[PDB]
Each structure stands twice: as structure tokens, then as C-alpha cells.
Amino acid sequence: SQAFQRQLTALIGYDVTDVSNVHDDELEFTRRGLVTPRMAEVASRDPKLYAMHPWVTSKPLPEYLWKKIANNCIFIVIHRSTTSQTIKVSPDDTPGAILQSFFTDFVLRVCGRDEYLVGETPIKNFQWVRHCLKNGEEIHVVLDTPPDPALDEVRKEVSLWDCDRKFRVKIRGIDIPVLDLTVFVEANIQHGQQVLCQRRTSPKPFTEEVLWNVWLEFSIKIKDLPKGALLNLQIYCGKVQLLYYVNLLLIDHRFLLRRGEYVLHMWQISGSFNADKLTSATNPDKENSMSISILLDNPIALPKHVRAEMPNQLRKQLEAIIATDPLNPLTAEDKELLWHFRYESLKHPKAYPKLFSSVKWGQQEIVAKTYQLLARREVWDQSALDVGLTMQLLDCNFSDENVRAIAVQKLESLEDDDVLHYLLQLVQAVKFEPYHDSALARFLLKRGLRNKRIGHFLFWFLRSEIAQSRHYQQRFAVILEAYLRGCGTAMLHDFTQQVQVIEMLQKVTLDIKSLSAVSSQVISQLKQKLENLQNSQLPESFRVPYDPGLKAGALAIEKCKVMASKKKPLWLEFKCADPTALSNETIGIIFKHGDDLRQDMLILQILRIMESIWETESLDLCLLPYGCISTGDKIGMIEIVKDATTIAKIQQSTVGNTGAFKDEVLNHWLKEKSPTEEKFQAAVERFVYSCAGYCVATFVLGIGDRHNDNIMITETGNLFHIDFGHIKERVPFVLTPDFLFVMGTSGKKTSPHFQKFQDICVKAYLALRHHTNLLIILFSMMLMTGMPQLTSKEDIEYIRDALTVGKNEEDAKKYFLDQIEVCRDKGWTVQFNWFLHLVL
Ligand SMILES: C[C@H](Nc1ncnc(N)c1C#N)c1nc2ccc(F)cc2c(C(=O)N2CCNCC2)c1-c1ccccc1
């Protein structure tokens, strides 16, 4: 009976039915809330297409993949059992069109993977194909029986506005079970990051109990409280310093004004725009944490719901405002203009964030007018999707549901490919929702239930935060529960196996790490533990979390290692469970405790967004954003990139443990890995592109100044950065004399390959700059939701500079070409300084 819930709790990693840490019924309301959305998508989804989850795209096939074709000819090696016949096919052939061509019912599965080439889309539009064309590989499929939908079967089942009183809250006091100066409470009525009204208590002495018994009357009227308003209660000591915070929605999920006695356990601060500050969750640590005691009282329920001509100077002023970037602050004058010309502004979708930031949300008549304005949103509805613009409306500056819902409206038009690109940060954006049940929450729910791949990643992203965010685990747990109740028994069993496996592996990771105080004569224990796991405890096979097409099989005990590191990560290799796998390659997974890999997920995901941006300008910069999933507290997994070594090690081989750093070694290493000259210059060009990619991407992100035992290269020239969570003079990025000699330059010269590198960099850079807004917002979101450390205005404003906002294109070329030159001017000075730093 309720054994199903026990399953779901183990899958979720948090007890959703628990009510030990609630002061209302919002979470439970949201479970019931999501039942319909879950049922509606579960009932409406095509069961066969959900069983095979064809991964496809409507983006045009890029130039770089077109130029790799032999005139409407892609070869597809089909497999029965023994041999395999090849078939010339047009890029535009549907998989049906190929099946009747081969027959000269069944379906084509990719060899070694849970991936199918099925559906009414041309074969150029399946990702697996575009992947094979990119890396220069042959397309191997198998004539297979379709999977039964049965396997996916789902186990079935007084007006606030008539109230002119000033709002007020009684502060009874604070109590802390264990703590020498004074302390006061600051009560804020918030909407977004905007403080509407503020009041303080008198300072009393900071004893383990402090009582005030004071009515704080606010300047705002009850009628003027907008939905999603937050009573943010804060505690300072003293000169002042913030010690604790908690929040409480003043208008609840049923539109009722919040009333009665509350005892709210509070969050502490580390020794600032952090998403965690926004949460409505209270601290679950009742025993240790500070708490505050309040009383709301007056049942009051909130009701549900000009010409456009102007002077020339004002039109220009307003257009100038509408044009500035998302982090340019609006002045009082700017806001007043936007709002007066409300309806002119409404015609420009790009005005929307700014205009909805010009709304006085603490004034009921103005919010009414704002809603009348959202009634007139034809142009918004008609505009082509700008994700950049849409993401801004979903960030911390917008707490109003109707405003936010129009963002989620635009997201509905995203094809499944693009939801995958933005899914991590859409899931992170749930952190900005005032309520647990939101348009965004349901959007993620339904897109996830509509598609096994979004669903798969949705699970791990949500679970990532449920395992290590007390601030948001409750909300996300509710959402994930909603998902698991509609994903199908097949996936429930998949997910179950994966969690079982990663818990086994993380334990071994944690235990091996305990047995070392940097080397290892006890790689004995590791191999011993892995043998014990593989004997009746680890399953025959499991889906690889960061690449769900791949199923892993038996471990390769002999190939598994621990690193001569401080954090002793594991290096695990598995046999692919799929007998149809044509490769011999193992599946390689690193397990690391010690870094916050949520930071790594975000940077790696932004790198993908960059790649996708580049694809729109027909540029490929061969970035290698390897798989990475954060699975728990300072713990996670990383996709092992095969045939790859660090730059440091290439230097340690032809020099030693010293900074002697020869300019020549990398090219030497490359030359000795390339078998032919055909592949060497291919390697070298692959490296010019890689290097350019990572110089630009890392510069824009402000993570370009790196230790070179944290930059790797494949044996085919593909450079890539690693260890992003690891983050006296500096440098823009890493373009060292070793890299420059592969490009055929030295000290103060130029070359064919180097001139290209600049040519590629400048294109790439200016390319990202065409999506300035999108990047600025993802960067702000990234910091706010994933780096508690780095969330001051100054931190967030780094990317304005790096993307040379306001500058013309030609001037931006001159900026970056200078950045490049700063590296030429520094050579090994920083690298060397890193050696002296990171080795003494
Ligand atoms: C630094 C490198 N990191 C990566 N390697 C491959 N794919 C990746 N995605 C990463 C990352 N991040 C690495 N990680 C290890 C993790 C666990 C472990 F037990 C050993 C690791 C090792 C490591 O020292 N090894 C010893 C040499 N054989 C490879 C494994 C490396 C590493 C690999 C090549 C060159 C230098 C170092």
C-alpha cells in the first residue's frame, strides 16, 4: 500500500510526507496542486514516442556539419546479428523512409545506447547523427523491437482591498538555545529585492532569550500588500552585522492574509544577493538554531483581477533606457518615464524587465493598472522567443505571478532540445518563485514528464539540491515527487538502480578518503572494496547519470585508481552492459568529495549555452564540457574524458617537478600522439579552436586565470579546463608559450595558425556579445543560486566589463586582442607563480 511512498522517499532523498518543519500547509497544498498537471501530461503523452524518446532538433544543420557531407550522403551501418550492410541515405530521409529502403514493425536503435532513430523528422535532425558528423564517426544502428509502453505504465489513483489599516506585526522576541553585546530585529516588507517598508525594534542586550513585545506598525496599508510580499525578519548585533534571517509570505497560497502566532526557526550567515535569503523555508535544525516569535492579527482574502504619443527627446531617452543591459540600474527618473509611457514601453518586449521594475508594487491601484497592462500584451505574445529576456523575468527581481507567468508562457514554445540547454538554470530559477506551486514548477513538471531525457536530468538536478539545500529541499522534493509519480514504472526502476549504485560508490569514495593522511600504499583496500561491491550487491547494469543513453555494467577493478591528491577522488571504469556496443571502451566515472560540484554543473552548462550560441554563427570551438552531476553534500561524479592528460604533466615529463617550463613540449607531445601528418595538423587545428574557445569562455566568466595542472588536452588536440569549483598580479586567460608554439609562434612573432586563433577568438567573443543580455542574466543567476561566496553587486557586475557593454564591435575587438597581448607580455610569470604558490 504505502510501500510505494517508501520507494519514492528513498528516490527523492527527503520525506515529503513529513510535516515537522512547516507552519502552514503550502507544501501539501502543492502536492495536491500538481496532481492535475501530472495526470494531464501523463494522459496526453504519446506512449510509444515516450518509450523511445527520440532526441531531435529543429535547428538548421550548421555549416561545419554540412561541409562534412558527401552530397546528400550519410552512411548508416545497420546491424542484424553477424554482418552489417551500409546504406546511402539523404539528410532529409525520415527513419521510416530508411526502414522501407532497408526492407528492399521494427525500429532503429543506436549501437550500445538507449537511443532510437525514430519519428517524423529527417535524420539530419537527430542529435546522435549530428554528434557522429561532428567527431567524424560512422552511424551504427540495430534493427530492434520497440520497447513496450507497458513498461512506462503509471500506477493510478473580508476583502483585503476594503481594509485601510496600516499593516503591523508584533515581535514577541527571539530565543537561541546557545549563543557579548546588543542585538535588534529588522522587519522588512519585501517584493523581489525591493524593500517596500521597513521597521526596527529597539536594541536589547543579546541574551539567550530576548523579549520586546512590540507592535511594529508599517507605513504600508493591508490593501496595499501585493501577492508574493515577504515579511523578511532579520537579526543584527552591535558597526551592525547580519546574523540571522527568516521570511514569511504575508499573503498565502489561497490568497488569504497571513494570521496568527508563528515561531520561525532562522538561518544563520557565513562569516549580498544569495537565493537562499529569499526562501520561505525555515531551518529544520530546531535544536541549535535561533528562532523568532511573532503575532499577526486583524479572515482577509485578496481579490483576483492611456494614449501612446510623445516628444522626440523623450522617445530617445526612453529608447536609450530600453537598450541598456539588465544590470544597468534604473534611476527614479528612468522608472518614472517608463511608467508614464507604460503603453509605448509595452510595444517593446525588451522594455519588459525594466518596465515591470518601474512598478510601485506597494500601491494597489498601480498594481491594478499593471495588470490591465498585461491584458494588452499582444506584442509580447506575438514576439519571437527571447530566452535572455524571458530568463530576466524569472529572476529575483520579479515576485509577481502574472509578470512571471508571461515568461513561462514564452518558455512553452521551446522545443525539447532547448529545454535541455536551459534546464539546470530553469530549475535553479524555481528558487526565485515566491510560492512552491508556480507556472515554472509546473512547466518543468510537464516538460519532464513529456520526455524521458528532460525527465532524467530533471530528476538529478532537483535531487542535487534536495540532497544539500535545507533552504529549498522541501520545495524541490515536492516537485520531484510530482515527477516520479508520472514518469512510469520503467523509469522508477531505472532511477532506483542509479541511486543504489551512486550510494554504494560514494561510500567507497568517502571511506578510501578516510584512510589517507600524498601517496597510497593502500590502493589495496580500494580494490578490495570494489571486489566486495561487485559480488552480489552492485547490479548487473545501471544508467550513467550524466549520459542516460549509456548503461554501465561490470566494474574494471584493475583500471580503478585513487588520485595522489588532497581530496583522493576515485577513478572508476565500467564495462558497457550493452552487448551491441561496437566500441571496446569502458565507461569512465570519477567520484570526488571535497568540491561543490554544483558550481561545476553551472559553469559546464553555461559552456554548452556558449557552444549553442556559436552554432548560430556556424562556429564550432570544440569545447569539451564533460558530464558532471552533483549528487550530495560536497560530493558528485565527473565524466572521465578518455585519452587525455593535464598540461602540467606534459611539462613534468620533459622537465620534472620544477617550473623550467619549455615552450616546445606540448607540440612535441602532440606530434608524438598523432600517428600521421593527416592527424597532426588536424590535432593542431582542433587545438587552435579549443584554445580559442576556452580563452573566450573563461574570460567572459572570469575564471580564465588558471593553474595549468587544471587544464587538460586530448591526444587529438582538444584542450579543455577542469576543476571549475577550485575557484600579486594576474592574467586574462591561459595562452602560454607552450600553446603559442603549437600555433607556430614564439615570444614576439605571428604565424598562419596564430592569426587564425585571433580571427577565431574575435568572432567567438563578438558572437557571445550578440547575446550580452542572455549571458549577463545566466551569469547573475549562476552566482546567486550556485556561489554563496561570490554574490555582491561587484561580483555580478564583472561580466558587464568582460563583455564590453556599450562599446562598438570594433572597439571590442581591440579589447580582446589586448587581452591576448597581456598573455604574450606575461609568458610563464603567472604559471610560474602558480607553481611557487601551489607547491610552496
Ligand atoms: C586530472 C585528471 N582529471 C580528469 N581526467 C579525465 N577526465 C576528466 N573529466 C577529468 C576531470 N576533471 C585526473 N583525475 C583523476 C581522478 C581520480 C583519480 F584517481 C586519478 C585521476 C587522475 C590521474 O592522476 N591518473 C593517473 C594517470 N592515469 C589517469 C588517472 C587524473 C589525471 C589524469 C591524467 C593526467 C593527470 C592526472
UniProtKB/Swiss-Prot annotation:
Enzyme class: transferase
UniProt domain PI3K/PI4K catalytic: residue ranges: 556-828
Activity regulation text: Activated by both the alpha and the beta-gamma G proteins following stimulation of G protein-coupled receptors (GPCRs). Activation by GPCRs is assisted by the regulatory subunits (PIK3R5 or PIK3R6) leading to the translocation from the cytosol to the plasma membrane and to kinase activation. Inhibited by AS-604850 and AS-605240.
Protein name: Phosphatidylinositol 4,5-bisphosphate 3-kinase catalytic subunit gamma isoform
Disease: Immunodeficiency 97 with autoinflammation: An autosomal recessive disorder with variable features. Affected individuals have childhood-onset antibody defects, cytopenias, and T lymphocytic pneumonitis and colitis. Some patients may have features of hemophagocytic lymphohistiocytosis.
Record carries keyword Hydrolase: no
Subunit structure: Heterodimer of a catalytic subunit PIK3CG and a PIK3R5 or PIK3R6 regulatory subunit. Interacts with GRK2 through the PIK helical domain. Interaction with GRK2 is required for targeting to agonist-occupied receptor. Interacts with PDE3B; regulates PDE3B activity and thereby cAMP levels in cells. Interacts with TPM2. Interacts with EPHA8; regulates integrin-mediated cell adhesion to substrate. Interacts with HRAS; the interaction is required for membrane recruitment and beta-gamma G protein dimer-dependent activation of the PI3K gamma complex PIK3CG:PIK3R6.
Pfam families cross-referenced by the UniProt entry: PI3_PI4_kinase (PF00454), PI3K_C2 (PF00792), PI3K_rbd (PF00794), PI3Ka (PF00613), PIK3CG_ABD (PF19710)
Tissues with expression: Pancreas, skeletal muscle, liver and heart.
Domain PI3K-RBD, residue spans: 71-145
Keywords of this entry: Angiogenesis, ATP-binding, Cell membrane, Chemotaxis, Cytoplasm, Disease variant, Endocytosis, Immunity, Inflammatory response, Kinase, Lipid metabolism, Membrane, Nucleotide-binding, Phosphoprotein, Serine/threonine-protein kinase, Transferase
Region G-loop, annotated ranges: 562-568
Compartmental location: Cytoplasm; Cell membrane
Region entry Catalytic loop, spans: 702-710
Location of the C2 PI3K-type domain: 163-297
Gene: PIK3CG
PTM-bearing positions, type Phosphothreonine: T772
Chief location category: cytoplasm
InterPro entries: ARM-type_fold (IPR016024), C2_domain_sf (IPR035892), Kinase-like_dom_sf (IPR011009), PI3/4_kinase_cat_dom (IPR000403), PI3/4_kinase_cat_sf (IPR036940), PI3/4_kinase_CS (IPR018936), PI3K-type_C2_dom (IPR002420), PI3K_ABD (IPR003113)
Cellular-component GO terms for this entry: cytoplasm; cytosol; membrane; phosphatidylinositol 3-kinase complex, class IA; phosphatidylinositol 3-kinase complex, class IB; plasma membrane
Family: Belongs to the PI3/PI4-kinase family.
Domain annotation PIK helical: ranges: 306-486
